[PDB]
Design a binder for this molecule. Sequence first.
Ligand code: SF4
Ligand code: SF4
Ligand code: SF4
Ligand code: FES
Ligand code: FES
Ligand code: CA
Lengths: 905, 147, 156
Amino acid sequence: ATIHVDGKEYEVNGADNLLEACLSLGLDIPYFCWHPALGSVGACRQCAVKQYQNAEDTRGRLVMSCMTPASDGTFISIDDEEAKQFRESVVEWLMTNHPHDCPVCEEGGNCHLQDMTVMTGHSFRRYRFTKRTHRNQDLGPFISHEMNRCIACYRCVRYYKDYAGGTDLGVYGAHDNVYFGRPEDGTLESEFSGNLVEICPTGVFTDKTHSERYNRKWDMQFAPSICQQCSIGCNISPGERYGELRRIENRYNGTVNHYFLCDRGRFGYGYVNLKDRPRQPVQRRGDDFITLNAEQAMQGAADILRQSKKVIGIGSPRASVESNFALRELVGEENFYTGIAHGEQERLQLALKVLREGGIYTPALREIESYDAVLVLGEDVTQTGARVALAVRQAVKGKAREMAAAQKVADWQIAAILNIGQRAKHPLFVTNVDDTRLDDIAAWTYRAPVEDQARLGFAIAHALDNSAPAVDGIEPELQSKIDVIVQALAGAKKPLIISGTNAGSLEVIQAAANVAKALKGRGADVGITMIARSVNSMGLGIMGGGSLEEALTELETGRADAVVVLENDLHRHASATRVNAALAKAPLVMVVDHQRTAIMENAHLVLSAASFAESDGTVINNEGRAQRFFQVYDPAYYDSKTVMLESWRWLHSLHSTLLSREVDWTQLDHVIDAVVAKIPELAGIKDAAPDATFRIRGQKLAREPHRYSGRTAMRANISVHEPRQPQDIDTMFTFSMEGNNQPTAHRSQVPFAWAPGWNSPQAWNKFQDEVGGKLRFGDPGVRLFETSENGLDYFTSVPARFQPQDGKWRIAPYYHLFGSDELSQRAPVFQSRMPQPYIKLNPADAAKLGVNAGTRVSFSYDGNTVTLPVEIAEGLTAGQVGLPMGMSGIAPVLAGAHLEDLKEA
Amino acid sequence: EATEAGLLGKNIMGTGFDFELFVHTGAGRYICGEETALINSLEGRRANPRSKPPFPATSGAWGKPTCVNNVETLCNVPAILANGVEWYQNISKSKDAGTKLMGFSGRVKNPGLWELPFGTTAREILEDYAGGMRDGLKFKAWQPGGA
Amino acid sequence: AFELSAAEREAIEHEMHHYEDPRAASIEALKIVQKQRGWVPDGAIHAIADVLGIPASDVEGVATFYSQIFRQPVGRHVIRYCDSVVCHINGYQGIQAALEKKLNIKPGQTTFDGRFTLLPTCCLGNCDKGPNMMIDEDTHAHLTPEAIPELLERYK
Ligand code: SF4
Ligand code: SF4
Ligand code: SF4
Ligand code: FES
Ligand code: FES
Ligand SMILES: [Ca+2]
């Protein structure tokens, strides 16, 4: 297609509309109601251009560029005087009722409405009458509501309802009293409600957690990082000010998480700002806790570790690849233990074997949206891998997309698409121990124990391919529903099988692998997704090591007299009594961590590690993508006595002091080279980001914007002498604005989006090759493994049906987006959002116990009696008891275990 | 009455055509008269109009093909099919075929509605049918087709 | 606080039978609840949503979009005087002044006895007989300001 804008010829995509085609060319057209992920609706009337019939036409006609196709031989003008006057008039109409709020508005300096007001050149007010005002609502702890600032662009309702699937946000009212909010006060119920703060072009929906400690966008220090709160690896831009992590912005990655995060990743960052974190090395001597600097901490630790006979190291899936590798090098390969339990490790290694040996392509998160049928087995995706659930919602709406494409309706005309595809949708079959948040769009939901979910998967695989092992004892009605699933999956051009390790069942993963193999054998373009538990679960699985039970065995038998625990609380993966006994028996415990955990009371030495905000490293996605996170700020810039080093730096210098009695604060690139030299299946992590010598025409990449303020006053209360700018030897980023952040710079790591004239999140348009596409020079991150040439064999270990045995209670895992992740549930704003700990019971089991809804029952696990109030779960099955995983006292390792002595307290 | 007389419902007049007719009472918005907003209000939604194309003929009520016509058009149809094309074309010597309900309202002698052929001048409507302005009133303006 | 009666639910389901989509009976369900109770209370929104299987925000958006679906409590009789251009020419201002003098309320308000709620409605479609008023179901045309203190006294 060829378009002519203002007499200049451009070659565009004819399937695009004119607004996105012209924004992809670098032309500036103001817009409000259009979003690249939401489509065109033509509400705000801001994007007007002048379209001419042909080259020899001068009159023309004002058209909405978002609603106009970029067809071949199109003639438009943006800088036409009539078009400019109309766009300025639209801005003026929006300005008539807008409140005088910019100094006390959290959107200021980050506001799309401010940018478009300046861009149209409207700065003179001639409206003299009153302004309409609105009451605000309480939307919960995360989103602050300020309805006066609304321009009625309908982006919030289109995102929250049509895109995200939420039900409790809407538009109410009429002519000019349109109200965007909830029907009543209350917490917004969607797991993706936090994206409203970037979807809303004004300051109606604002980050309340940021608003408590507000600072402007130009005052932030940003870095490109990876969210640490689950395994999806969404790209984030954490920004800090005055030594504390202030905000998490979405960092655009066209391959992973393009515009959206979930609320856990957006709002669970508050554990970084906790005041009980270790900020200096501490050695316990007697009852005293002597504070050390880095040098003498390394010397004393090296002396005690040299005096010991065997040293073991316990890693964590929280820690990065470099940190776990450094611990593995310090203690030796045979003495290194993954910090997760044996069953967790077995399920994780099986998921890895399916991903990198099953011969079936594992999609990226953006690619999930293009699949034609989804089967989810055992994985409560919305509570464990939430952005996969959002992508699955888009994949389900793909059927309405196809039906509208059959009637020659353009891809961006979203309202016509939703009108054609009324309630038709692609098949979704979810399986869980209870109801999920995907049940509203699921074609079928199977609520069953994990044995029965695995049996359903094996039966589906056998019905698709008779070479798969058969299942004996399927009821005829369940068989009919299985046949419905098989007809939906066999007719799909791109079926997608999603499972994961959060079900606590190996057989569920085996059944999902069998279904994916059966669909692969029929010629389908099948994909398989595995949801792991933690940010670097897949990296820890690739690195390998013994289980936590083997490490505790070594500590309890006395074969190991020194243990180094890296970023692991050890109570989420084993019983707390056994961990406490093993750590009390060991004469040397050294905890390298950034959070105050319960095992530090047994620790002889505590090394104050850095969090993701204060460290660099590599983490491995649930799809096997290696991604770097870069340090946001120097922790010692404000508090000079803070000794908070990276975990790989601590462990590498400790290894160097153990060998040659000299400390060695290494560089990140050296550790990455060591990883790719010693572990060949982690060799892809070298290409995740360029090394520290990378430059854009000789200069580094800036962490903070050009207008960063307070350079000679922010530390002036400590000392009037401005300190040295902190030097970053690990990465290509600088701790200053003396660097490059151009949208046209040849790089993939973008710390934050800013363009002149574009201060809002809409500045990401300048950083993309096409708007809503990829980044201009490729998205960051690299897949570690390719699709295998040959797949696996069928798993023949079909489990038996679940049998409720008296006295025992199978623990059904219930996951929560706010509470199940360890560090995020340590964040203070999650405590208001955290549900009360309820033990979930079947009505029949509660009637057998005599227990009603709300009475407190006591149950003993590992000889420890704990008491919880009862919530009746109708979707649960008899003989199972539902427990909230990862909460206070309930470890996620309890999933699949049995329970004893359940009685009323 | 038309249902109990066999004119509506299943197998009308023995042809085999099934047609069911419903009456949907609105809840009072002027924008509901706009045909795409009418379709939105029929679907139980807020009566925002829809952008065209696509027109309701291809994707209308609940995505199905839908045709929206005024009361007077559908009242013109039965006489057309009961008398013929040439009768409907031979009642007015104008480019607009057929008759139309026209009438003057507001401070006139006889406000009301009369069926007149197209091409009738407004002055003769006001003076003959409406009777002209009332006593002691001077005509200064008029609107031909509503607000 | 709110519970739909059996007759209300039966009427709502009967209206749901008339449409391809159960969402399309939202306006009729709101009008049924309003007819039975004078107005649509706050719990009725979630009750209608639960019966129809649509979100409560959709029901609330429908109820607040349409001016005839009352969302605040009203009086026993709703006076709806016409406001549009033809009744402006025919002198609806005298009728509005007579109503405000007789009832001592501004438009949009309810009398202290809870008897009348005064509302300026749109054009009533009776322009050749203006000015027009619509009390609860009855349209009164050819209004004069002297006939209001007789017209309002047969609606007890
Ligand atoms: S929303 Fe934007 S324009 Fe409105 S007060 Fe806030 S910063 Fe100013
Ligand atoms: S609240 Fe924000 S996103 Fe929603 S219509 Fe108003 S300005 Fe647009
Ligand atoms: S889906 Fe996972 S990785 Fe993405 S924002 Fe949420 S917690 Fe973070
Ligand atoms: S962006 Fe085109 S009208 Fe809103
Ligand atoms: S203008 Fe009042 S009835 Fe039409
Ligand atoms: Ca660093």
